[PDB]
Structures are given as structure tokens and as C-alpha cells.
Structure 1
Amino acid sequence: KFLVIAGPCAIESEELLLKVGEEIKRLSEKFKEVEFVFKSSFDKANRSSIHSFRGHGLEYGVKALRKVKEEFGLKITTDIHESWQAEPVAEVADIIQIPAFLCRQTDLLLAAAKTGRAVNVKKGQFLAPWDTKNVVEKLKFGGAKEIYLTERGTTFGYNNLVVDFRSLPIMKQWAKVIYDATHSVQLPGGLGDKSGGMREFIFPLIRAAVAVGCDGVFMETHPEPEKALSDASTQLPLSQLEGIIEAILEIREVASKYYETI
């Protein structure tokens, strides 16, 4: 069924995770035809500035994520940054996420595939849609069986990303496709010390994604984005999540009749 990956960008505290997890659990009960996966990074290993928030470490993160899965019975997903992290993360993560900048790092992909867990690779901003075929092949070689590719924008001049929706049907040829609705509108290094983005385009573009056809969507959501320690300009207010989900489900219901085969 349709996948909805959502949660706060970074694990600012297990408290934050629980509050968001409580809402995702509620929507999970309201939208039975949707498979929700809770997401949150234990480390922002690629911040632009050395002085920006990274996190509380892998152990605290994996612990907080365990709390969410045990308390709400929600599937989990988080990203890894170096090969050694795959094993400990797989203890809780149902889906191991591979960062966009690291989508070509062979050992990271193999490490993730070896855990036996599902793997979701963020398509690098430097990659062409057809270049992802090789990515999937590495994962299959590594033993991965459940593989996802996430569209999160492509480099378009400086400090800007564009979403080429032709990528959805192209990547669908070799993997399930997820559309990252929040990172696709961010402006890389847009604010000098941090990245920017236009929240006003999150909804319009997610509607486009389901109209074109995808297997799921990815959304960063925070109770108060303004106070977020990461992606404060792009995380979706928690309260607006329900409305957006219902909206894309309705559009998908009507549009699905026209999704092209393979």
C-alpha cells in the first residue's frame, strides 16, 4: 500500500519524537490504507556549518527511536553515514536510509543491504534519473530485496533545486519510488550558514507527485518548525499533516486510473 514516511528531521529529543509519534500513530489509525513509517535522523552528518546542530549521537538516537516503535508500534527509518552504523541501526530501523550525497558510496549501500532490512536511497542532486539503475543493482548484489529510490530534487544552478517529475516514471522501472516533499523545496546553502526553502511549494508539488504517480511520500514534520534545529524553513507544521495526507489520497484515488504501466 501507499507509503507515508514522516517525522521530525532530527532527533532533537526523545520527547519531540514521542509527541510527533503520537500524531503519526493517530493518523495511522485513521488512514488504514496507508503504511506510515516514522523517520528522524540521529545525526545530521552533512550540515553546511560546523556550528550547526548535529544530534545526540547514535546510541541516544537508536534508543529514542526504539521508544517510538515500542510505544506506538510504528515502523522506523533513519539514515546512516558510514558503513559501521548499518548494523546497530538495523536493530530498530525497518528501512535504512542512504543520504543523497552518499548515494554512490558502494560500501555504505552494501553495509545497509547486508542487514537484511529495506533500503531507501535518496537520489543525489547530481544524479540523472536513469543513473539510479546502477544504484539498485549494487543493493541487489548486496542482498537487498525491498528497495526504494527517493526523489528530492536536482541541482539547478546555484543554491536551488528543481524537481524533474519525469524521474518518477523512469525510476519506477527498477524500484519503488518515494517523493521527498520537504527537501525538494529547500535551497542548498541558501542562508549562508544554513539552507533555505519555500514552504509554500510543499503542498503544490506533493499534489503533482501523486498525480504523476509514486509509491509513497516523505515529509519532514515538526510541531513548531520555526523552532526546529534543522530545516526550520521547510519542515511541515505537525497540525497540517492530516489535511495533506487526505488530499493526496483523494488525488491518488482519481489519478491512479491513469498511472502508466511500468
Structure 2
Amino acid sequence: EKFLVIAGPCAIESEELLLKVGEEIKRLSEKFKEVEFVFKSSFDKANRSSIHSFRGHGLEYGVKALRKVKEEFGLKITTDIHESWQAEPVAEVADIIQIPAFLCRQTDLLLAAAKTGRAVNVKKGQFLAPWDTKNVVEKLKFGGAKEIYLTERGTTFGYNNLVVDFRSLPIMKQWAKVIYDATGSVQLPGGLGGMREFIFPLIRAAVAVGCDGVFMETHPEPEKALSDASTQLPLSQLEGIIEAILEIREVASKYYETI
């Protein structure tokens, strides 16, 4: 099956930022034809730790910017929703509606996304056990969702630290396609946080174990990003990472267990 790569800047800092990242993602989509690329960016960071942190430029501006990326590069789109009313307007441009980690249990939000007819990708809550995502998928199917993804992004391990229990990949694969969030899994919640040095090794682990796609927030200059500055992957490094995981996936694939 075509490998999925969801990538883009964490937040829609500006329409210019999106087009710049979109251009590179488009270039990579032309090279890696065996990969299905989906451009990602949030119109709002609704769960920042501090009230003083950057949130965004609003839904309207965000949807408009994402539409430009889709029209200019012909790339599929994904963004996250935070409250039920946002599903409808967002569904106008988003091919995949993303459900934030902390909201993976909010029934109305999941139902709102499912009835749009769009694909739905749920970030697995840091408090959730792998086997408990079965009911999350059940809610989505109940709501009309036909294309469902579950994204592994770490589990609470002590304070301000997340661990990736790779046993979750084959467990969740029992009821949905699985995506591995390479940048969210190395963040240190309320750290100041994150450790970029572990992004690559863990993504290699993900593809060796076996998943249906990877999720990576990428920015031209992570050091200057307005959100997740400690975990976003430098755009210049995206190509090499993708080539590497495709190579590891190929050699490991014959050993992937059947569900």
C-alpha cells in the first residue's frame, strides 16, 4: 500500500511560510512517487501552555492559506479541529481532519469530523493505552468515518517526558491504519521542550516495526518557529529522512506480521 507522509509547519505562521514548505513537499512528491504526501499545518494552536504564546491568525485566514497550497501544488491537506463547529468549514479544504491528542476522547468532536465524509486522523492521547483506541475507532465508524488513522505520539512517562511504546503500532493496526508522529514523540511537555537528536533514530524504529505512514512537522528554520521550535525538523533534512525510511521499510516489509 502507498506509504503516507504527513508533513508541514506546525503552525500557519504566514501564507508565505506555507507556500515555501509546500514547494519542497511538492518537489519530494514528484521524486517519491510511491509515497502519498499530505501537507499539514494548524490554523490555531488551541492548547499552548502559556497564554502569551503564538496561537495563529484565525480559521478564515488558515483555511484560505491551506487552500492556496492545495490549488498551487495539488497537494492533499490536513489540519486539526478543536471544537465541533470547526469541522464543517475545515472540511471544505482538508482531505484529512486531525483530532488533537488531548481531545481524542471528546465524542462530539470526533462525531463532527466523521460526518463531513473526510478522512479522520486521531492523535493518540498521552494518557491512552493502545488497546483503548479500539473504542475511538468505533466512535468514528459510528459517526460515518470510512478512512480512519491513529497516530502514535508518545505516552506520559513521569513528568515532562514522553516515551514511545512501539508495541502500540501492531496493537492499533488491529483496527485502523497507523501513523507515527516523529516530531511530537520527542517533545518534552512543558519542558521549558524537545530533543531533535532522537527524531531520526525513533522514526527508523517506527518503520522497522511497521506503520502505514509517518507524521513530521517541518520548518525552514525550526529555531525561529512560533510553536514547537524544539521539535520541528529542518526542511532541508526532510528528503534524506524520507529516503531513509523508505529504504528501511522496504527491507523490513517482508517481516511485517499479519493482523
Give the TM-score band, short-chain normalised.
over 0.9
Matched, 1:77 2:74: no
Matched, 1:204 2:201: yes
SS at match of 1:64: helix
SS at match of 1:219: strand
SS at match of 1:187: coil
Cα distance in 2 for partners of 1:52, 1:153 equals 23
CA deviations over 1:87-116 (Å, ceiling 9, x no partner):
000000000000000000000000000000
Cα distance in 1 for partners of 2:17, 2:81 equals 20
In the alignment, what sits opposite 1:256? 253
* 1:125 Cα offset (Å): 0.1
In the alignment, what sits opposite 2:33? 32
Task: Tell me how large the CA RMSD over aligned residues is.
Answer: 0.2
SS at match of 2:179: strand
CA deviations over 1:125-161 (Å, ceiling 9, x no partner):
0000000000000000000000000000000000000
Cα distance in 2 for partners of 1:227, 1:99 equals 23
TM-score with structure 2 setting the length: 0.99
SS at match of 2:33: coil
* 1:234 Cα offset (Å): 0.5
CA deviations over 1:64-107 (Å, ceiling 9, x no partner):
00000000000000000000000000000000000000000000
In the alignment, what sits opposite 2:174? 173
* 1:63 Cα offset (Å): 0.2
In the alignment, what sits opposite 2:227? 230
CA deviations over 1:30-75 (Å, ceiling 9, x no partner):
0000000000000000000000000000000000000000000000
Cα distance in 1 for partners of 2:245, 2:186 equals 18
Cα distance in 2 for partners of 1:2, 1:175 equals 15
* 1:178 Cα offset (Å): 0.0
TM-score with structure 1 setting the length: 0.98
SS at match of 1:214: coil
4+ residue segments displaced more than 4 Å: none
* 1:13 Cα offset (Å): 0.2
Cα distance in 2 for partners of 1:28, 1:57 equals 29
* 1:165 Cα offset (Å): 0.0
SS at match of 1:97: strand
In the alignment, structure 1 segments of 5+ residues that lack a partner are: none
* 1:190 Cα offset (Å): 0.3
SS at match of 1:52: coil
SS at match of 2:254: helix
Cα distance in 2 for partners of 1:181, 1:108 equals 25
* 1:250 Cα offset (Å): 0.2
